[PDB]
Design a protein around this ligand. Structure first.
Ligand SMILES: CCCNS(=O)(=O)c1ccc([C@H]2CC(=O)N(C)C2)cc1
Length: 126
């Protein structure tokens, strides 16, 4: 079985709209979402379909871009750092589970470089 996917909605959570969060959805997420290497990261890892029975034994903090997208659409993040941390958990999860040179790792590394550049270009907090 798969675990429940991470929380993406929480009506009682602290909520605000900021120019850096708008940028993270409009620029960072969407730039990564259209990438030719995005598809394995666009939804939670399905350990049943992929026959990875050990995945959720090793990965205890799952994360993916589908969850990030929904968290941004739902204003779930209070600041850019909370969003950035989820991206970094997605990347590191992939490097922990897999091995250097694996196709899935090469894909994550392409996305990570783009992400890093987009965070360098974060607009000034307004
Ligand atoms: C380029 C490799 C494609 N092979 S695959 O059988 O479709 C496939 C295998 C494994 C995954 C998981 C593993 C992982 O760490 N993820 C973010 C996703 C996803 C897809």
């Amino acid at each position: 079985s798969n675990p429940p996917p991470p929380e993406t909605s929480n009506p009682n959570k602290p909520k605000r709209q900021t120019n850096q969060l708008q940028y993270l959805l409009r620029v960072v997420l969407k730039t990564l979402w259209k990438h030719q290497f995005a598809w394995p990261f666009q939804q939670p890892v399905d350990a049943v379909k992929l026959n990875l029975p050990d995945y959720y034994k090793i990965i205890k903090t799952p994360m993916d871009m589908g969850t990030i997208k929904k968290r941004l659409e739902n204003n779930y993040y209070w600041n850019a750092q909370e969003c950035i941390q989820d991206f970094n958990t997605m990347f590191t999860n992939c490097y922990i589970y897999n091995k250097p040179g694996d196709d899935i790792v090469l894909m994550a590394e392409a996305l990570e470089k783009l992400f890093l550049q987009k965070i360098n270009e974060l607009p000034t907090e307004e």
